[PDB]
Amino acid sequence: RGRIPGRQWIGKHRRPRFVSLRAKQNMIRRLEIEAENHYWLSM
């Protein structure tokens, strides 16, 4: 049981990927950096 038709991560019916908690934090950490980059590029 539990077959994903074809290849896992391509096509119409893919294996679902879920967002963990550290993946969210990792992205937010990047955003806070680039938001401060906008501030120093403004003067």
Binding site: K12, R14, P16, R17, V19, A23, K24, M27, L31
Partner: peptide
């Protein structure tokens, strides 16, 4: 591949899925 408009909800790129999760009310 698949068109941009589909009868079924189309699976997102993982980077987009993460974006939608950070930008939640």
């Amino acid at each position: 591949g698949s068109k941009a408009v589909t009868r079924h909800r189309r699976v997102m790129h993982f980077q987009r899925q993460k974006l939608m999760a950070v930008t939640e009310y």
